[PDB]
Design a protein around this ligand. Structure first.
Ligand SMILES: Cc1nnc(NC(=O)c2ccc(C(F)(F)F)n3c(CS(=O)(=O)C(C)C)nnc23)o1
Ligand SMILES: Cc1nnc(NC(=O)c2ccc(C(F)(F)F)n3c(CS(=O)(=O)C(C)C)nnc23)o1
Ligand SMILES: [Co+2]
Ligand SMILES: [Co+2]
Ligand SMILES: [Co+2]
Ligand SMILES: [Co+2]
Lengths: 396, 381
């Protein structure tokens, strides 16, 4: 945590493009995720689009783009994602269940970002192709069975997602306010070699970094590093467990139940996460996502000190009604809530956030939003535990 | 009504689906059908074998079960390798059709003795519960479950109940019929009738169908087969092709107000719920305004029109009907929402009951659909 930014990207990583989850049936996860996140179906490539290889359904809420893909029974030239391996998809679901297979970035050229990546260490995974329309697809391995997909497309274009995908516009479809992906975090057994591997090939630089003296629940804990693209728009953190602890990490609990490295959580950022949260919790009771237990009152009594200078009492009283966590950085405020495990295993979960502050000006006096404004809520580990404990003593 | 049941076949207990992840289908089916989570059996209940979630709307009981990564299994038939293959081979599909029986062990021994291929040897789940399985068709088992009348565990032993406040139903009251698609009808029916003593309710000859039923005609197990030497393509062969063999084609879920139910179901369509087939052409409804004007108001038929409900009649009773689009990724499994009007006939002590099958199964509508489609296309040049 020097916080420098050497702009060392080896390829132009413009933005997150989508995230592809694999499973045995895409209809069902897509279904739930739509209702739960307010990310209605925006595109499909199934049998009805002439694709006999895979069934791909795509949820969108603004920039947020959750792709769900699954194999049909048993062609192959009908695939719209030609990286797709039925054999490998089947394995993935058997090994993990609901989990993220790919993390896609939009880049300048897919061919180039690969070549530069592979040349700077990256393990290949899918050899660049032209999907027509001037769309490029290329994949390198990131951690474990998770791949880093590259996607390039002329700025105008047609196929809004990928060639072969037929758009979808249900009327009655409403989003809940999720604007963008913020960060995509991977649990790994040992951090150093993984961190090196990626920065090695992407040219991403360290943005932040927390070890675990009081950054890990109880005896166990985690060692987190954050890797950032030049613009600090794309953030790929990594957790590892702290070794030789007395109790077991949840980063280890993940690794065990998941059967390897993989994406632990994805943070979905909103411009009114409170408003978003209301919609999301209304669905909780009928098949949406359920959230972690609300912090006890003491927590908030504390956020009235920490962040009362920048949050109104009407805001904080709402943050409390909705179990939202609060954290400050050098110059900003992070609102933060975590879902319960989203699939069957205590593995993957989602993070809903809002970033308040850090808006700087350029060389002509134009305001931009500094990414990572508010940090990632490292304080809430420590601050939950002590309030959770102080609560219980308050009960004799 | 032969009355040949070889075991005590009380009622449908549940239908169990195998996927790679129960959370997701159980979460979706929940708000698509209005069937709130009613019971779980997973890590948080000490089961590390498998993850089961039970949706319940009245008597409708949808169980979703998925393997994890020993003695901890709540359903001790579960085999993880089987599930792995099931999901891989079918996607989302019904694995188990469960009947409530008097003893289960007895149901098994009787059944097996009368031809049934064994699947799971009788267990005692505890709390007076009995569980056994035999082969129905394909991978699909017929699961016997037996409990004491009151009992404890609402579902099965090892299952913590669930009651989120703000849960709702959309009126679905029970399972009406569970239809299986097979390649050849004659052998399958022979086998099922052979071991259950279910009798033929009726027989269609699209597809060729038979409806095996229990003594009370409360449990209905239809069976279709594709038409041999077919000129076109059968929706049953399609099924058989994309699904990779015999399996449950659809399940009809009955409602006391199918039209109110439907309203609720259709509002969820846009945000991830089920979508229903295209509505029939205007002619269709002028047709029902003829064949069924005497039993349905002019205001009722107009709601059927709004919502795409189909109508049919039998000797003495009316059928409302609406099918869902394939509920999975594959064009295989779908679901029927139906209401049965009439046929509440008396016994010999006075006590009238609702007779099963009231309104038939909508078979007629097959032709009426096709004919109204043709007609409507002509009048549009
Ligand atoms: C880098 C980077 N990106 N995000 C992060 N950190 C988190 O997401 C994070 C922050 C705070 C907390 C909490 F306050 F609640 F303890 N987190 C948790 C909670 S937990 O462990 O499920 C819990 C069940 C122990 N998970 N991730 C985070 O670091
Ligand atoms: C036995 C037994 N139990 N139920 C039945 N019949 C049906 O469910 C059934 C009735 C009517 C119709 C329809 F009106 F639309 F033609 N069905 C359909 C239509 S379909 O094929 O999806 C169509 C999309 C090819 N599927 N099952 C039925 O038979
Ligand atoms: Co580039
Ligand atoms: Co986070
Ligand atoms: Co019996
Ligand atoms: Co039917």
């Amino acid at each position: 945590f020097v916080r420098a930014n050497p702009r060392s990207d080896r390829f132009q990583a413009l933005a997150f493009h989508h995230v592809e989850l694999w499973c045995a049936d895409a209809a069902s996860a897509a279904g739930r995720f739509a209702f739960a996140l307010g990310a209605p179906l925006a595109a499909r490539s199934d049998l009805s689009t002439g694709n006999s290889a895979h069934a791909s359904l795509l949820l969108r809420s603004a920039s947020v783009a959750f792709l769900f893909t699954a194999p049909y029974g048993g062609a192959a030239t009908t695939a719209s994602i030609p990286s797709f391996s039925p054999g490998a998809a089947r394995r993935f679901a058997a090994d993990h269940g609901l989990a993220v297979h790919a993390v896609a970035l939009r880049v300048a050229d897919a061919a180039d970002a690969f070549r530069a990546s592979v040349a700077a260490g990256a393990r290949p995974a899918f050899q660049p192709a032209d999907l027509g329309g001037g769309f490029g697809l290329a994949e390198v391995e990131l951690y474990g069975d998770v791949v880093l997909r590259f996607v390039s497309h002329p700025d105008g274009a047609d196929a809004p997602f990928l060639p072969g995908f037929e758009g979808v516009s249900n009327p009655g479809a409403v989003d809940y306010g999720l604007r963008r992906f913020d960060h995509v975090v991977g649990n790994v057994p040992e951090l150093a070699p993984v961190a090196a591997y990626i920065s090695g090939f992407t040219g991403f630089h360290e943005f932040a970094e927390f070890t675990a003296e009081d950054v890990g629940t109880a005896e166990s804990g985690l060692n987190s590093v954050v890797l950032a693209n030049n613009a600090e728009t794309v953030l790929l953190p990594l957790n590892e467990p702290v070794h030789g602890t007395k109790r077991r990490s949840q980063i280890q609990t993940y690794l065990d139940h998941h059967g390897g490295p993989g994406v632990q959580h994805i943070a979905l950022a909103s411009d009114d996460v409170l408003g978003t949260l209301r919609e999301m919790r209304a669905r909780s009771a009928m098949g949406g996502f359920e959230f972690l237990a609300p912090p006890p009152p003491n927590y908030y009594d504390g956020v009235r000190r920490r962040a009362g200078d920048v949050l109104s009492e009407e805001q904080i009283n709402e943050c409390q009604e909705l179990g939202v966590l609060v954290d400050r950085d050098d110059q900003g405020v992070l609102l933060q809530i975590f879902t319960k495990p989203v699939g069957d295993r205590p593995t993957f979960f989602l993070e809903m956030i809002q970033r308040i502050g850090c808006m700087e000006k350029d060389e002509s006096g134009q305001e931009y939003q500094k990414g990572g404004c508010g940090g990632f809520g490292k304080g809430n580990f420590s601050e939950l535990f002590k309030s959770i404990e102080e609560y219980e003593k308050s009960l004799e």
